[PDB]
Write a protein that binds this ligand. Structure first.
Ligand SMILES: *[C@@H]1O[C@H](CO)[C@@H](O[C@@H]2O[C@H](CO)[C@@H](O[C@@H]3O[C@H](CO)[C@@H](O)[C@H](O)[C@@H]3O)[C@H](O)[C@H]2NC(C)=O)[C@H](O)[C@H]1NC(C)=O
Ligand SMILES: *[C@@H]1O[C@H](CO)[C@@H](O[C@@H]2O[C@H](CO)[C@@H](O[C@@H]3O[C@H](CO)[C@@H](O)[C@H](O)[C@@H]3O)[C@H](O)[C@H]2NC(C)=O)[C@H](O)[C@H]1NC(C)=O
Ligand SMILES: *[C@@H]1O[C@H](CO)[C@@H](O[C@@H]2O[C@H](CO)[C@@H](O[C@@H]3O[C@H](CO)[C@@H](O)[C@H](O)[C@@H]3O)[C@H](O)[C@H]2NC(C)=O)[C@H](O)[C@H]1NC(C)=O
Ligand SMILES: CN(C)[C@@H]1CCN([S@@](=O)(F)=Nc2ccc(C(=O)N3CCO[C@@H](c4ccccc4)C3)c(Cl)c2)C1
Ligand SMILES: CN(C)[C@@H]1CCN([S@@](=O)(F)=Nc2ccc(C(=O)N3CCO[C@@H](c4ccccc4)C3)c(Cl)c2)C1
Ligand SMILES: CN(C)[C@@H]1CCN([S@@](=O)(F)=Nc2ccc(C(=O)N3CCO[C@@H](c4ccccc4)C3)c(Cl)c2)C1
Ligand SMILES: *[C@@H]1O[C@H](CO)[C@@H](O[C@@H]2O[C@H](CO)[C@@H](O)[C@H](O)[C@H]2NC(C)=O)[C@H](O)[C@H]1NC(C)=O
Ligand SMILES: *[C@@H]1O[C@H](CO)[C@@H](O[C@@H]2O[C@H](CO)[C@@H](O)[C@H](O)[C@H]2NC(C)=O)[C@H](O)[C@H]1NC(C)=O
Ligand SMILES: *[C@@H]1O[C@H](CO)[C@@H](O[C@@H]2O[C@H](CO)[C@@H](O)[C@H](O)[C@H]2NC(C)=O)[C@H](O)[C@H]1NC(C)=O
Lengths: 322, 171, 322, 171, 171, 322
């Protein structure tokens, strides 16, 4: 009569690595590395993202005519920019503090696009139908949907002066532009003033702009330049616009709501009827694993990104079924 | 292994034992069969489950983390942001890979210890009433039925009951 | 006769955690996590801190009249700002590179407030008693203690020009301001010049300022603005002030000494007759433990901050006294 | 435990042994008492004290570390400074918690090893002059006085002195 | 050590054994000599070589990393860059020093385990045909020539061949 | 007859440290910490570095006359600045975005110094032999080799206007300067225009400069100032210079090639006929070890820098030869 002490074996072919030995076949093991995604853009915590389509952030905020207009009010969980965002700024120039504006948008969860200076009621003594071929729409010359190109009316450009009081209870993002003609002949033709200036003031913003006239290399067939500026108008505060020329005036502004967990990503993936807790530019992750090797850019509650190809922890024994 | 049982003096495992990590195989006149040691297997299961949970628990949930943009005159800031992102990724990849490697080695030694301790428990109970025949097996110097076998699998083997008969057969 | 091998047991109820098992009762253990503080502001390495009281950094440096004046010379180990620092800039405007100035102050261990441009000897042809209701003191209109509001004298504002040579052997921090009236009528009334300018130059600083006149929303009942500027005058260097208007001239400057281990913290804790090697905004730490979970902000030689609630290392054995 | 002594074949500890971590309890005609093994206890104390000192030593002194301020147009820098501060805190909390957990497990196994090694030292000295009666106790086959007991507690047990008497009683 | 062999019941090492980490010394009528156990030594060499390679492998190649410059009005950025550089250096110095310390302890215990397991392999083969005389040595109760010694060094010791002669000498 | 089990011992005196015990003598050990360097500057991956000699980055780019001129085309693997770089900017002023320029140079592997505006063909109506004692060469007054000080010719400074089209297929770095005289008398003498201006435009660069006249402390015996500016001209783009005074015009520009693994280091070590895969400011490292404690600044493929004095891993046994 005999009794023997022994241990379990099975047909498992899982392998793990140790400090002393690689490629150890074990009876049971647990994978800790998430490598699977669904390849789709999904709602995050039940909230759909904001897709800008052919527009980048600059094109959407300025109102590039070649992008499908969005609904007046949108709410989102993250922002998607398509990799080949050909529609952005259409009239050449510099977007001052543009990267800072993107960082502000990354913590925004909603916008309301509203008319801050009505087109047919705010500029009675000025011309408001200025368009350019650099911002074409359907082959025709056009302009930004959210801005107004003011020019002289009846051979006169009176000193304009308009203000807005923020009664929305939320931050209002105001965008405007300054045009710099390539020669003094055009400056007199458009604005009738050579010593022109623009003044924009709030309780915490105070800047003055002056045209700088010079001939420049053509960009999108424009020797002129248009510099774009922005500021966040606090609840209850007033913004005052003062100019005798060169002002690309605001028409529409955005009332912004602040949220958490949002951001801006670049992806060519398509939106789908799905929900996830973790979104990457390549796809969504449905996993409770501590690590993932899919993408370093994540939205939501996600596994930690690592460079590893395999993270398998042994739970069972060394497998010796011989 | 560190304790010499798994792939040691017990050369191989048992595919016939499906219900536990460690156990016994017996052979007497009533027949033979495998029997998993439920106490050591369940204790090991509780410890291993806790080890995996600890590994997952120590890793925090990764909340939203996206990139930033920089203009042509902010190269230094862009390189510093890249240096921060690269450095953190280096450490976490290093931390994760090492932790799995180190815990994997400890897990195998943990199972090796349990097999050895189980073997020593039986050896101390049987004393000179059986003989070590290698490969982690004992040959009894007396008849041991299913009731006698069960007294070995649990902690209640009666050494004085069989000492006289074992002494005669041991000769 | 018998002999037995055994191990120690006692009445200890200390518990530690392991990889395989939680809540293990042990005979002896060592706590590594510091969680206790005295709740007071203390001297650090025998040096008392600098408490700004109701003033923030900006209010103290400009000389806000509503803060108790400090002694001419102070030395400190860290700087304390009270959370509700209602007294800062009192005349609305922008403090240029203010955050950079705070970072400079964080490595400063001493100041000497001295008269750089004496009030009754530096501006003989200018008016120097300008005060504002926005910087009130005891209900009366006042002005910054360290600055001088220059205005026209006898209907004339001559081009002023003053210089200072740094003979202190230490960096001298010079602060000044530029006033921007809300309309051209006030600009002529105060400074008699419409094309006014201010010039401030040293061997490594060179800036020119020009008033930008526009009506603005009232801040602290002021439509005007006052922009504040600073520079660190190196030992031996000269600073030259040149203006024909709008200059808010320096009167007092600070000779600064550089130290190590200092910083700026926010705390509502009170100063006490105590000494410590480690100070936090919540209180002082007297500990040789490697970790603490009291506050991430520390001054001195401190335990490393972690988020953990418990860090107990076992030294003894598993406690089985049954 | 990994070595099977603490909470193993020696089920419980001794509150009556106050002067050391490991030791002996003896019983003969002269009486009984506890006696801590000073050599193994002191060696363990030196090793454990060194382990705690190493943990403290590896953590550098945290010198002054305060926050920074940023204006409304430096959000990216403020978020990068926050990302750096958060990331370092994540790693150090992770490093500290794991180190204590891993060293705690090794400390318990270290004590378990010392008990087992002490038990094996006595077993090798006594050989067949005593019998294993479980729970880490030995019953002598001969009279063993206080002098004989002390020769077991230190390394100088005289096996040939008692072999003849032990053989008769072992029978 | 954790397993009690090195600097334990085997007090010292052998300078005369140059060809391996562990082995045997024999003494019979034909003479004496050292003989390294090639199987355990080579297995240990493979494991240790893998441990060192793993330590080197886990550390990535440090590519170009230089400092940056900042003007008098970028003190905050300069301090943040310094904070990042200091923090990463703190962690890597901490990671490197701890890893060597922890792996050093495991390496010594690994060698200690191999000596103990080798000793137990011989003890199980010899059974009662030899006696433990301390210091990790066995005195045979029978004549054991070079062929008999080699059957012990490898796994093929013939216990039944010498049981009768050993019993007479054991008496 | 006896057989004994034992372990190896030798005469080794290597010591390692463990968690439980320090100073353990072992039979075999492996050093992981690299502490040895050759103390020389070497070629990196077969490419020699760029040594600036007595010049810093600013002096080399502007063309300080006191530095030995380099060959028209150079390629390198890293850039060496000598610690006492006494030759930099020689005419006092500010180098705008100088630190950003250094960061750009750190990823540059080659330059071609070419004539962008030929000296005797680009400025026919202007004077081009302006020199200063602040940029002396061989005791004589001189000027930057890459720039031209334009002044009035025959009592006239006509509005200049010149452009360059980048046909090099690589980024062209263009440097220029703006001079600020200390008084209006000199401004009229040099440039004949008091309302002078300089305009520099490309497709993505657009800046206008205006002299700011004031007397200033003497720096290198100059009360005037010279502000230096730069921009990277993209392949195919045009840069246009427009000024009626104060322009320190470009003469030579650099066509730049982009590489990887390069950087700027400070060292007093000397170049030698050697090759290495890892370069530090103190010397080169020839090692396959994972760690080094030589210097935190490294070029190439290098061991990771740590603060440790010793990192020795035990491979053998505890050494007990007694
Ligand atoms: C890691 O371990 C696995 C499993 O132990 C290794 O895969 C195994 O490799 C061996 C030979 O390298 C294969 O054995 C061969 O099988 C064929 C067909 O049965 C037979 O003709 C040969 O004579 C030999 O016996 C074995 O099938 C294979 N097992 C698998 C793939 O499941 C693997 O090579 C090890 N190394 C690495 C780097 O993965
Ligand atoms: C961690 O371990 C401690 C100590 O082992 C646990 O505390 C203990 O909990 C048990 C029951 O959960 C208590 O036993 C009970 O005592 C009462 C009164 O003596 C008796 O009526 C019950 O029948 C039972 O025996 C024990 O007193 C208590 N010891 C303490 C608090 O010191 C603890 O629950 C474990 N778990 C955690 C998460 O802490
Ligand atoms: C670390 O370990 C080494 C080696 O074990 C220690 O060095 C050794 O130190 C001892 C005394 O501290 C020296 O022994 C002395 O030797 C002299 C001359 O042989 C003799 O006159 C004395 O009576 C005593 O025996 C021994 O030579 C020396 N070995 C060396 C240096 O190789 C070392 O002290 C330990 N501690 C540290 C912090 O390194
Ligand atoms: C988010 N993930 C990663 C989760 C988070 C929590 N778990 S978990 O920790 F429970 N994982 C495991 C996964 C597998 C095991 C394991 O080895 N056996 C399960 C129990 O029966 C064992 C057995 C023994 C003998 C014969 C047959 C079967 C096999 C263990 Cl012990 C724990 C993972
Ligand atoms: C800055 N702090 C954290 C300091 C830094 C340095 N220490 S230290 O490393 F010495 N800590 C300890 C704290 C406690 C112990 C310990 O378990 N016993 C002390 C010695 O007697 C032991 C004993 C055994 C049997 C019966 C009664 C008593 C109990 C040890 Cl071994 C080390 C901590
Ligand atoms: C980039 N470096 C750091 C490289 C990267 C790869 N190696 S490596 O991992 F192979 N290092 C070593 C270095 C030394 C050893 C070792 O202990 N012995 C070598 C084999 O014979 C052993 C012996 C035993 C008994 C008697 C005499 C001799 C001694 C080992 Cl096992 C590995 C280091
Ligand atoms: C351990 O196993 C033994 C089997 O030998 C159990 O002892 C027997 O238990 C049954 C219960 O149905 C009794 O009828 C027998 O009389 C017992 N045998 C003897 C010799 O008394 C024992 O109960 C088990 N112990 C456990 C499970 O704790
Ligand atoms: C180990 O313990 C034994 C106790 O049996 C010690 O041996 C005795 O030591 C005393 C010293 O006072 C002598 O008088 C006795 O004659 C010794 N006994 C015998 C049988 O010779 C021994 O010295 C101890 N060894 C140590 C402490 O190293
Ligand atoms: C283990 O060692 C023994 C030595 O006793 C080997 O057995 C002998 O092998 C030789 C081969 O030349 C034969 O001539 C002898 O007849 C063998 N001895 C006996 C008693 O049969 C054995 O081969 C070795 N096993 C190995 C190396 O695997």
């Amino acid at each position: 009569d005999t009794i023997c002490i022994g241990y379990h074996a099975n047909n498992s072919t899982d392998t793990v690595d140790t400090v002393l030995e690689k490629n150890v076949t074990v009876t049971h093991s647990v994978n800790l590395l998430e490598d699977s995604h669904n390849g789709k853009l999904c709602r995050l915590k039940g909230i759909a993202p904001l897709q800008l389509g052919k527009c980048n952030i600059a094109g959407w905020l300025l109102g590039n005519p070649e992008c499908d207009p969005l609904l007046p009010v949108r709410s989102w969980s993250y922002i998607v920019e398509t990799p080949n965002s050909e529609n952005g700024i259409c009239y050449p120039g510099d977007f001052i503090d543009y990267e800072e504006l993107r960082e502000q948008l990354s913590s925004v969860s909603s916008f309301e696009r509203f008319e801050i200076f009505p087109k047919e009621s705010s500029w009675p003594n000025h011309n408001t139908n200025g368009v350019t071929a650099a911002c074409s729409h359907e082959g025709k010359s056009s302009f930004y949907r959210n801005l107004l190109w003011l020019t002289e009316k009846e051979g006169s450009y009176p000193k304009l002066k308009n203000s807005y009081v923020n009664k929305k209870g939320k931050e209002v993002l105001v965008l405007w532009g300054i045009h710099h003609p390539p020669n003094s002949k055009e400056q007199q033709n458009l604005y009738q003033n050579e010593n022109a200036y623009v003044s924009v003031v709030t309780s915490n913003y105070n800047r003055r702009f002056t045209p700088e006239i010079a001939e420049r290399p053509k960009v999108r067939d424009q020797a002129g330049r248009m510099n774009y500026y922005w500021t966040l108008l606090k609840p209850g505060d007033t913004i005052i616009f003062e100019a005798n020329g060169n002002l690309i005036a605001p028409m529409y502004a955005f009332a912004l709501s602040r949220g958490f967990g949002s951001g801006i990503i670049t992806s060519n993936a398509s939106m789908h009827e799905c929900n996830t807790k973790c979104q990457t530019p390549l796809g969504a992750i449905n996993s409770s694993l501590p690590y993932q090797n899919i993408h370093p850019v994540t939205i939501g509650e996600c596994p930690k990104y690592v460079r590893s190809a395999k993270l398998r922890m042994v739970t069972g024994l060394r497998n010796i079924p011989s | 292994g560190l304790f010499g049982a798994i792939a040691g003096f017990i050369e191989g495992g048992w595919t016939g034992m499906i219900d536990g990590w460690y156990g016994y195989h017996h052979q007497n006149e009533q027949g033979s069969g495998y029997a998993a040691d439920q106490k050591s297997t369940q204790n090991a299961i509780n410890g291993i489950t806790n080890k995996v949970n600890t590994v997952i628990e120590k890793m925090n949930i990764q909340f939203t983390a996206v990139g930033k943009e920089f203009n042509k005159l902010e190269k230094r800031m862009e390189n510093l942001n890249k240096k921060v992102d690269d450095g953190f990724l280096d450490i976490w990849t290093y931390n994760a890979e090492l932790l799995v490697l180190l815990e994997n080695e400890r897990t195998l030694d943990f199972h090796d210890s349990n097999v050895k301790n189980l073997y020593e428990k039986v050896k101390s109970q049987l004393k000179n009433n059986a003989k070590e025949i290698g490969n982690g097996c004992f040959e009894f110097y007396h008849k041991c039925d299913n009731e006698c076998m069960e007294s070995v699998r649990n902690g209640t083997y009666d050494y004085p009951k069989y000492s006289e008969e074992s002494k005669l057969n041991r000769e």
